[PDB]
Structures are given as C-alpha cells and as structure tokens.
Design a protein around this nucleic acid. Sequence first.
DNA 1: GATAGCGCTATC
DNA 2: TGATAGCGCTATC
Length: 327
Amino acid sequence: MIEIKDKQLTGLRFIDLFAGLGGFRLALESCGAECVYSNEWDKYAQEVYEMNFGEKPEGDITQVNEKTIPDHDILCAGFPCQAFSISGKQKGFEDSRGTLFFDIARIVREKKPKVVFMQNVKNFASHDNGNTLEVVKNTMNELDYSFHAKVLNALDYGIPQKRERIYMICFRNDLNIQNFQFPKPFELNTFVKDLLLPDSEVEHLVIDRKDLVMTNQEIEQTTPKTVRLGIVGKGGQGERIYSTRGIAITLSAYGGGIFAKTGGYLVNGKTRKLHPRECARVMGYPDSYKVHPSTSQAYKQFGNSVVINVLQYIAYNIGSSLNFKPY
DNA sequence: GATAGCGCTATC
DNA sequence: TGATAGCGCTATC
Ligand SMILES: Nc1ncnc2c1ncn2[C@@H]1O[C@H](CSCC[C@H](N)C(=O)O)[C@@H](O)[C@H]1O
C-alpha cells in the first residue's frame, strides 16, 4: 500500500461490508476515515480480521437489520463475484451468492450514507449483456445517488498484477459532487521479482513435475504484463507458469490446479507457486499485516480480496471531491 | 478442510 | 480466428 500524508477522509465514518481481510479498512483508515462497523460471515476471514483489527465482524448480512447498522458516511462493499466472474457459471442474480447487492441496496435505503463504494470483478460490467450493471445503476439512481463506474487494472497503479476490477462510486445526489474522477494510470516501476521472498523461505513451494513443458524463453527485460513461460499438465488454471520478470496473474479464491490460487512462476531456475506473504505483496498489503495460519485459507482470503493501493487512490479522490466546497 | 484436474467463457 | 487468461467448479480422501 501507499503512504498518505493528506487525510482526505479525516472525520468521516465508514462501514466495512463483506470485509474479508479488511482491504477496504486499510484503504480508508490510511485516509483518515474511521471504521464504525464491519461484516463478514466466514469464520476464517473473521479470525484474520480480528487477528488484525481486534474486532470480529458480524455474521450473515442477509439477516442483519439495516436499522442496526451504525450511521456512516461511506459504505464500502466488495461483494461476491462467483455468480459473475468470467471463471464461473455466470448465473448472476439467479445464483444464491449473487443477490447480495440488494442487501447493500437495503442498507443504503436505510442509512443513506454520503457515499457508496463498491467493487467486483471485470466480467461484472458486461455480465448478461450489461443488464446486471444496469440494474445496479438504476437501483442506485433510484435510491437517489449518482453512479460512477469504471474498470481499472492493478498494473496501472503501481501493483504488478494483471487484476482488472470494476469500481462503482456513488455520491448522494443532494451533495453536488461533480468533480469526482478515477485515478490516472501511471507507469509501472515494479514487477513480481521485486516482491518475492528469499529462496530459503519458499523452498517448500517448489514443485517439479515431469510434465513440466517449458514453451517460452525467460525474458531479460521487465514488462508491465504477464508473460507465460511454460505449462504443466493440460495447462488449465493453476497449471501455467509465468515470468517473475513480468507481472503476476489474477490471484483467485477457489482456484485449483497444482499452482492453485496463485499460478506458477519461474524463480532461479525453479517452478513454484507464490507464498501467502507474496500474495499479500501482490495485493498491496503491508508486511505488517498478519495472514491467517491456514495457508489454504490464507490464499483464498487474498484470492478474493482487493488491491489496497488501488483502493487508496480511489478513496483519496473520494475525499478530495467531498472536500471541495467553495463559497 | 485441503488438494488439484478441469472446461468453458470473454477478448481482440 | 487462435492464443491466453479467469475474486471459479467440484470430486475425492
Ligand atoms: N451473507 C454474507 N454475509 C457476510 N459476508 C458474506 C456473505 N456472503 C458472502 N460474504 C463474504 O463476501 C466476501 C467477498 S470478498 C470481499 C473481500 C474484501 N473486500 C477484502 O478486501 O478482503 C467474502 O469474504 C465472503 O465470505
């Protein structure tokens, strides 16, 4: 994550829904905001959240009374994506894990925060011909908020990961917020290699399969993209090896394959999957963040989390706009 | 719970 | 296309 001298969000309170690892909390708190409520129903996510914020989030949101939620100025929510990801069945709102957005909508109608900050995967924008993103837009417009939606790629904001995500920013209409903008991309000066751990600490992640077929020459120079060097098995998800010299592929929560959830990488002549800590780095988490003791649970948590750095630039810009009020 | 083979969709 | 990539799916122990 990035350092922030000017706390655009000082004095503002926020709710952390679908909290997971608390990526949103890290982002807003770095901007001066104050978390007043958090919600995450996964037992393991809860322990990590606690292991890092002292509190345990509240359970199943679909059964929490909105009227119970503390007053807040900014609602944060990176809701479920299984029902919309390019990697899933795309059942959308027909999938039980796909209606969570309306739970948010219910919270907003009740608490009417000054801003609504949401996040989800890229395929969300075009899912079902774009009708899902429209329901969200209208639903928010109908709640009387503006709808700023855009897809950003992490690799464009200082993080070496080809993770493309859609960010939806909504300001309550009564506030004439009209200068909001998404962060301008900037050249990438960091790559996978720069965030790796010493060999001695990842020796155990090294894999060596007879079906390892190297199909491409390691690259000399650093590029701001993913470069496939080889493959294992049929080359399906988690069986593709990339160059640490380029940027990392999109971490996942339920992914399988020998290099499950992180993908394979070529380091000093060896093929291995990323270490939980490296995933953290790949996601923008500060090394001072304590990861869950279960490596599998830890990869899953980072897998469906968010890139702190990106969140920061958006949060800082959210503050900027909210703060511009000339006479 | 942890592990890992997969198989289809979206993109240009 | 044809090649690449995806906060995924789910069977098995
Ligand atoms: N009914 C429900 N109540 C609370 N959390 C729920 C939920 N259904 C799904 N979730 C949670 O939705 C989260 C989506 S992933 C969001 C990750 C988060 N922004 C981060 O930075 O870590 C998951 O952690 C999942 O456990």
